[PDB]
């Protein structure tokens, strides 16, 4: 849990590199075909 929260998927393929959690969520949103601005503009709703 700590690894997947503080470093995303990097810790599973080498050294663990830190990254802020909203930026990781933006990365994962890009993973499924949605742009970052959607998450950055609906962060509060998504967290709720």
């Amino acid at each position: 849990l700590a690894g997947t929260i503080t470093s995303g998927w990097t810790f599973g393929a080498g050294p663990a590199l830190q990254i802020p959690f909203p930026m990781q969520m933006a990365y994962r949103f890009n993973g499924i075909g949605v742009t970052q601005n959607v998450l950055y503009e609906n962060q509060k709703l998504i967290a709720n």
Binding site: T35, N37, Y40, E41, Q43
Partner: peptide, 27 residues
Amino acid sequence: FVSGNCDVVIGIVNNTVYDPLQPELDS
């Protein structure tokens, strides 16, 4: 790429975005 304005995002930062076209136009 541009989207929206500078109040919705949390953690936005002042900086400058260079435009390649302007110096060519002025030259």
